[PDB]
Amino acid sequence: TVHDVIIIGSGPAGYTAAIYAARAQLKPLVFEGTQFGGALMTTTEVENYPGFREGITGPELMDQMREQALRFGADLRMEDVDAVQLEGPVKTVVVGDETHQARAVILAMGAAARHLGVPGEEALTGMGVSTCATCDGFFFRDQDIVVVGGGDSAMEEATFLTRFARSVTLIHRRDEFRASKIMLERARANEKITFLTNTEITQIEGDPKVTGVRLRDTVTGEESKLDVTGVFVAIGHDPRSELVRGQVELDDEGYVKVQGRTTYTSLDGVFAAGDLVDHTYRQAITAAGSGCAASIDAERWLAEQ
Amino acid sequence: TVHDVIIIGSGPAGYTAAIYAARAQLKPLVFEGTQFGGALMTTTEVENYPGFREGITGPELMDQMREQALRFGADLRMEDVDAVQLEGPVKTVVVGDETHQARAVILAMGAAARHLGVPGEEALTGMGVSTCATCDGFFFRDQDIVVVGGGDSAMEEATFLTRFARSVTLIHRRDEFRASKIMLERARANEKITFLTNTEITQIEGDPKVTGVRLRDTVTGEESKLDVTGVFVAIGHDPRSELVRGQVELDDEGYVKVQGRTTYTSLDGVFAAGDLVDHTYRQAITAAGSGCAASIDAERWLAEQ
Ligand SMILES: Cc1cc2nc3c(=O)[nH]c(=O)nc-3n(C[C@H](O)[C@H](O)[C@H](O)COP(=O)(O)OP(=O)(O)OC[C@H]3O[C@@H](n4cnc5c(N)ncnc54)[C@H](O)[C@@H]3O)c2cc1C
Ligand SMILES: Cc1cc2nc3c(=O)[nH]c(=O)nc-3n(C[C@H](O)[C@H](O)[C@H](O)COP(=O)(O)OP(=O)(O)OC[C@H]3O[C@@H](n4cnc5c(N)ncnc54)[C@H](O)[C@@H]3O)c2cc1C
Ligand SMILES: [Mg+2]
Ligand SMILES: [Mg+2]
Numbered sequence: 001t002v003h004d005v006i007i008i009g010s011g012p013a014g015y016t017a018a019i020y021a022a023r024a025q026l027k028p029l030v031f032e033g034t035q036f037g038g039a040l041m042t043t044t045e046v047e048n049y050p051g052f053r054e055g056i057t058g059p060e061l062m063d064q065m066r067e068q069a070l071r072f073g074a075d076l077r078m079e080d081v082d083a084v085q086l087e088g089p090v091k092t093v094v095v096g097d098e099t100h101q102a103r104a105v106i107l108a109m110g111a112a113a114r115h116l117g118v119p120g121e122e123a124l125t126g127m128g129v130s131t132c133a134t135c136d137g138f139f140f141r142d143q144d145i146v147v148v149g150g151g152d153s154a155m156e157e158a159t160f161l162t163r164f165a166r167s168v169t170l171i172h173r174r175d176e177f178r179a180s181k182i183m184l185e186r187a188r189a190n191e192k193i194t195f196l197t198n199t200e201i202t203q204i205e206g207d208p209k210v211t212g213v214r215l216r217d218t219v220t221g222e223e224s225k226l227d228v229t230g231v232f233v234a235i236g237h238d239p240r241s242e243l244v245r246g247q248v249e250l251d252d253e254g255y256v257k258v259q260g261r262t263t264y265t266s267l268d269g270v271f272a273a274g275d276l277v278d279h280t281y282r283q284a285i286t287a288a289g290s291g292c293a294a295s296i297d298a299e300r301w302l303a304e305q
Numbered sequence: 306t307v308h309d310v311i312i313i314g315s316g317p318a319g320y321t322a323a324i325y326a327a328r329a330q331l332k333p334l335v336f337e338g339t340q341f342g343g344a345l346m347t348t349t350e351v352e353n354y355p356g357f358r359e360g361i362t363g364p365e366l367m368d369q370m371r372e373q374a375l376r377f378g379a380d381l382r383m384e385d386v387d388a389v390q391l392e393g394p395v396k397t398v399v400v401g402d403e404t405h406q407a408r409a410v411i412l413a414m415g416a417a418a419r420h421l422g423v424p425g426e427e428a429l430t431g432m433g434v435s436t437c438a439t440c441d442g443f444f445f446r447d448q449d450i451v452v453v454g455g456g457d458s459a460m461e462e463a464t465f466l467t468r469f470a471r472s473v474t475l476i477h478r479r480d481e482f483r484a485s486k487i488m489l490e491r492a493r494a495n496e497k498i499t500f501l502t503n504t505e506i507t508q509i510e511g512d513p514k515v516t517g518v519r520l521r522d523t524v525t526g527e528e529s530k531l532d533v534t535g536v537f538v539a540i541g542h543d544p545r546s547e548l549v550r551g552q553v554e555l556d557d558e559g560y561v562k563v564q565g566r567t568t569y570t571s572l573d574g575v576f577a578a579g580d581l582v583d584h585t586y587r588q589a590i591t592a593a594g595s596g597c598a599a600s601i602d603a604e605r606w607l608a609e610q
Contacts, residue, residue, distance in 0.1 A: 016355045016590060023353055023443055025468050048328055050321045050593050051356050053372035067358035134601070138328055159608070163330050186608070261566060261585070280566070281598050285321060288355050289594025293586050296439070303464070303491070 002090055002101045003029045005298050008081050008243070009108030011038020012284045013274025015065035016291035017106045017298075022072035024299050029075045029100060031093065036078050037062040038110060039275075040284055044126040048135065049284050058126075061284075086247045086270050103305065104269045104298045107248070107256060108291060109240035111275040111282070116148060116233055120204030128210025129231045133157040134283070137232075142166045145230035146213055148201060150174060154234035155183035161232065162192040169226065171196045173218050204231055239276050248272070255279050263294040264301075271297050307395055307406045308334045310603050313386050313548070314413030316343020317589045318579025320370035321596035322411045322603075327377035329604050334380045334405060336398065341383050342367040343415060344580075345589055349431040353440065354589050363431075366589075391552045391575050408610065409574045409603045412553070412561060413596060414545035416580040416587070421453060421538055425509030433515025434536045438462040439588070442537075447471045450535035451518055453506060455479060459539035460488035466537065467497040474531065476501045478523050509536055544581050553577070560584050568599040569606075576602050 005021050007014050010032030021028035040046060040058030047055040056064075070076060077095070084105070085092040091105045113131040115121060121129055130136040133147075137160060145165045147158040150172040158170045170187060175197040177184050187193050196215070202223070203214040212227045239255045241248075249257045249266035256265055256272040263271040273294035274287035310326050312319050315337030326333035345351060345363030352360040361369075375381060382400070389410070390397040396410045418436040420426060426434055435441040438452075442465060450470045452463040455477040463475045475492060480502040482489050492498050501520070507528070508519040517532045544560045546553075554562045554571035561570055561577040568576040578599035579592035 012355065019353055019355055020439075024439075024465075047377075048324055048597075049356065050317065050324055050370045050373060050597075051354065051361075051366055053369045053376060056356075061356055064358045065355045068355060071358060072352075134325075134329075156605075160329075160604075182609075261583075278566075281601055283594075283597050283601075285590075285597045286594040289588075289591040292353075292355075292588050292590045296586055296588075299465075300461075304487075 002103060003027065004102065004302060005029070005104040005106060006031070006091070006093055006100060006102035007106045007108060008093065009033070009038070009110055009274070010036040010066070011040070011108065011110050011274060012065065012288035013110070013291035013294070014038070014106070014108035015062070015069050016288040017108060017273060017295040018069040018074040019065070019072060020292050020295035021298065022069060022074040024295070026299065026302070027073060027075065029102065030069065030077065031081045031095060032076055032078050033080050034078060037066070042125060043135070046284065047138070081243060084243050084247070086244060086267050091269065104271065104302055106294045106298055107244060107265070107270065107272040107276055108274050108294070109243065109276050111237045111239040113233065113237050114235045116201055116235070118201055118203050120206065124204055124206050124210050127208060128206060128229055129204060129233065131233050133160045133232055137161050137164050140165050140230045143229045144227065145169070145232065146171055146201070146226065146228050147232045147234055149234035149236070150177045150179060151236060152179045152183045153236065155179045155187045157232050157234040158193050159187050159190055162190055165192065165230070168193045169196055169228065170194070171199045171201065171215070173200045174198065201231070237275070237279065237282070239279070241276060253279065263290060263297045269301060307408060308332065309407065309607060310334070310409040310411060311336070311396070311398055311405060311407035312411045312413060313398065314338070314343070314415055314579070315341040315371070316345070316413065316415050316579060317370065317593035318415070318596035318599070319343070319411070319413035320367070320374050321593040322413060322578060322600040323374040323379040324370070324377060325597050325600035326603065327374060327379040329600070331604065331607070332378060332380065334407065335374065335382065336386045336400060337381055337383050338385050339383060342371070347430060348440070351589065352443070386548060389548050389552070391549060391572050396574065409576065409607055411599045411603055412549060412570070412575065412577040412581055413579050413599070414548065414581050416542045416544040418538065418542050419540045421506055421540070423506055423508050425511065429509055429511050429515050432513060433511060433534055434509060434538065436538050438465045438537055442466050442469050445470050445535045448534045449532065450474070450537065451476055451506070451531065451533050452537045452539055454539035454541070455482045455484060456541060457484045457488045458541065460484045460492045462537050462539040463498050464492050464495055467495055470497065470535070473498045474501055474533065475499070476504045476506065476520070478505045479503065506536070542580070542584065542587070544584070546581060558584065568595060568602045574606060
């Protein structure tokens with residue numbers, strides 16, 4: 001059995017591709033992962049996804065998307081793809097000890113936000129810990145918060161957040177910043193931003209919501225506690241391109257490269273959508289739009305075979 | 306009063322840009338038009354917009370989007386922009402005899418699908434008349450339908466539709482086709498497609514839904530009636546770039562050109578989203594994703610000023 005299309009991933013990109021492919025009668029086979037539903041499964045209220053005047057939670061939105069795909073005939077499997085063979089007329093994915101094949105593959109594995117890896121970080125996610133100023137900055141009006149990171153991302157998150165927050169403490173584990181000089185001086189010019197270099201968070205405190213961070217100086221080991229009600233982690237993203245490295249062309253940071261304004265990768269019959277590709281916008285609505293595009297690309301490409 | 310951003314248009318691109326800009330505290334001023342709400346205001350059920358497991362009507366979805374923008378502080382005006390001055394640090398839009406100014410402008414005027422311009426076409430829209438095989442092809446299973454057009458669009462719509470329809474009659478007012486030879490031969494190879502050249506529709510019949518089309522031979526004037534329950538118009542699209550012609554760079558078909566995978570136009574501080582730019586995918590979810598991108602671009606650009 002060679003399917004028309006296999007989709008790898010179950011965030012907004014993968015489920016939108018599945019909805020379109022299923023409605024196009026392609027009978028898409030979708031590997032969602034065991035940690036299915038994408039990044040929004042791991043947040044609370046989603047307010048900037050257009051179509052919900054009063055908002056919707058991440059899990060509620062993603063279940064709508066999943067049920068929508070099912071309604072149109074998508075074959076959803078809550079399992080991880082462990083290896084792929086993407087070159088040639090028939091592509092293979094390996095799922096544990098099972099194999100599945102298809103004429104086209106849509107890559108929608110997303111990107112992982114890098115974690116601090118400290119106690120409290122996971123528990124308090126959506127309760128004061130965030131990875132996305134655009135998404136949750138809104139909810140920290142007049143509060144004292146921290147941003148963690150030393151790159152342009154962190155500089156952009158910190159400066160953007162000062163339009164809501166009472167104060168922003170920008171923490172970085174070294175005394176040198178990889179951020180561009182322009183972003184660095186923008187943050188230095190901001191009166192609401194204080195820098196804490198050679199500093200790391202060792203723990204995030206909070207009974208139901210974030211109440212403080214435990215800090216350590218990375219040179220002297222001196223520890224202290226800072227009272228804050230928000231922690232924004234901005235230490236980078238890791239596109240989930242491990243499966244396809246060596247097969248499809250990646251840029252220097254591991255993002256899957258695509259042709260022009262399409263979803264075509266360097267490999268015939270292989271298409272890529274979402275934050276696996278996009279290192280600029282990184283929103284649910286942009287990932288959903290790209291997943292639709294990937295399925296239209298795949299449909300058009302299949303028609304030419 | 307110079308606003309941070311003015312948005313022109315109120316389809317998915319314009320309302321998504323408004324939601325993001327308003328939530329970013331930019332207080333966007335949005336000119337929706339008198340025919341507000343975009344193309345979906347002019348359809349019935351929308352089934353492929355991710356997030357609605359049982360679907361939603363076009364007007365219901367667009368009202369959610371409008372109310373969402375309002376909730377976050379967008380200033381919405383149900384009026385047409387009649388002229389723009391887009392060059393320089395301060396942009397001006399003219400609305401009747403009123404003027405409004407802004408540092409950034411987001412162009413989201415969309416594209417008009419070309420109409421047959423015959424009696425019945427407008428009345429039966431969403432009741433058997435469609436402009437979008439991807440969107441409504443689903444609903445014509447085992448039915449006899451027509452597709453109108455002579456280009457690649459029409460060839461793609463007709464061939465795609467044969468996976469649902471019992472038959473497809475492809476009508477074109479000349480005996481020569483502007484479609485590429487590959488698309489033309491794909492349709493000629495399809496056993497479910499019959500060509501009717503030198504033929505035009507003069508009227509679409511239907512008590513509540515489409516029941517037939519009146520046909521005329523464009524050479525001899527011979528008229529007849531065809532029994533069909535669907536009409537797909539695929540005679541092209543006209544991007545609504547009239548306002549900005551001579552100011553922002555357009556391609557040969559009038560679409561606004563953008564830089565790379567961003568929404569930046571040829572003019573500093575001017576950004577473009579949706580079907581005004583995209584002549585490839587033309588879906589609500591892709592237009593919404595691009596409107597989000599336009600507002601993130603605009604936010605980032607404003608921050609650099
Ligand atoms: C905490 C948090 C809050 C956010 N809040 C918002 C918000 O309010 N608004 C907004 O617009 N955006 C928000 N975002 C961003 C948004 O969630 C992402 O931009 C979007 O989900 C990216 O979609 P994607 O489909 O490309 O990837 P992802 O969402 O990362 O989804 C990819 C999925 O595919 C699975 N997968 C990966 N590899 C495999 C494999 N080999 N086999 C099987 N499955 C696999 C993953 O486990 C994951 O479930 C938030 C992100 C985070 C982390
Ligand atoms: C009948 C029909 C059914 C469809 N069904 C579906 C479907 O089921 N699923 C799907 O994904 N897509 C569907 N589409 C396509 C989808 O509607 C479009 O791709 C999408 O709406 C494009 O969004 P946009 O914001 O770029 O432009 P548009 O939707 O065209 O919106 C632009 C808006 O801006 C206004 N505007 C323009 N110029 C000015 C001005 N000078 N001043 C003020 N306002 C102005 C316009 O009047 C319009 O209201 C359908 C389209 C049609 C025509
Ligand atoms: Mg996840
Ligand atoms: Mg309209």
